[PDB]
Design a binder for this molecule. Sequence first.
Ligand code: NA
Ligand SMILES: [Zn+2]
Lengths: 422, 4
Amino acid sequence: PFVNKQFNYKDPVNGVDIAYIKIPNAGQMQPVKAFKIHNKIWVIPERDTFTNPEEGDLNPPPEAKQVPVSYYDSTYLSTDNEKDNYLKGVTKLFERIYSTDLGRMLLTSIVRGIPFWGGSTIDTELKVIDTNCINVIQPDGSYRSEELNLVIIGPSADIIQFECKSFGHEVLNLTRNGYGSTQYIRFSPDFTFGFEESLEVDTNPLLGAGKFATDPAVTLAHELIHAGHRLYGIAINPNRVFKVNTNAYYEMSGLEVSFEELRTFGGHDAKFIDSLQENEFRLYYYNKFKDIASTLNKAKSIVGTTASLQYMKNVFKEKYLLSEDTSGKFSVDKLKFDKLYKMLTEIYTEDNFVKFFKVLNRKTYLNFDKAVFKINIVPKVNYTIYDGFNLRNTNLAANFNGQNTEINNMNFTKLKNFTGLF
Amino acid sequence: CRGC
Ligand code: NA
Ligand SMILES: [Zn+2]
């Protein structure tokens, strides 16, 4: 299994994989209980009021002022039972993802995607960037810095606004310069979204109630794909967008969708990113990887006692799949770069995960949400690692009956309708 | 991000 231990929220802290921690938000915060579910990956069963000091208010703004697609509940994830369920739900989703070859590939890339040690000012020393770590309270009450790649945390005020958040650098664009940074995914396994089986209905803002429910494993995978891009520092600047011209409703409102989202969804959506721009990005990131190979060649000393310069240089040789010549000078090979870049951007896509999970899902990112549902995937009678909602040898096994909220109505509680609100 |  991907997660070797079946953590219970109430398990006593041990200062190793169950501990109270603090994140480098450059601000003050009370320690929160976190769980390390796998090498380099932690889960914090708390609403995210930490990554963004200006978003520490879970209370919903005035009713006369709410986003069409948004859902607020200041009480969600405030009790121990909820946190226990959140932990188990997230764990089950990691297992479901890991149970597929594609998921195993993605998770392996994520674990290997350690944020680059580019925090030194002297180009002859290799040093870690402190915001790619968390402070763990040890048994003796002291804090110890631990590097990590991924953190799954509860959503902020808007419960359905799942997203990858990471701490920036004063000068470096860590998610776009090949370096990478620790990713915090705001996510919840306790809610899901309804979509429509007919493409003409799903892509229309005035039709459909949300008959089918999105499998939360796909939703998490989507965020993990973004995380993969960001950990390898090849995320596409959100300023680069597609001026949607394939949907009259998006058009009549001048709605634009970032290339990063189209890339992440994959399938036909990825084709809206023309060849010219696609090559521009590839070249840009290729040069960034070159800079990394160069910085490593200059490094003649390592900072800290955690690991040896030899170890870290190898850690990044493997992450970026660099080449090494007679002298030991690293360089980026075009073939290996294209292969890794392609893996992270074309193999790991939402559309491909749908194929592996064999579930019904939105056919394009360019659609309109219909509703948000409350769910409980923890009980095996409701959802499993192997079949999601479509339980084998039951009436829910075929035709995605498990995702059909009308047939499998006991597993879904519609909290809000979005159709017509756009 | 989920999007619209
Ligand atoms: Na978002
Ligand atoms: Zn997204």
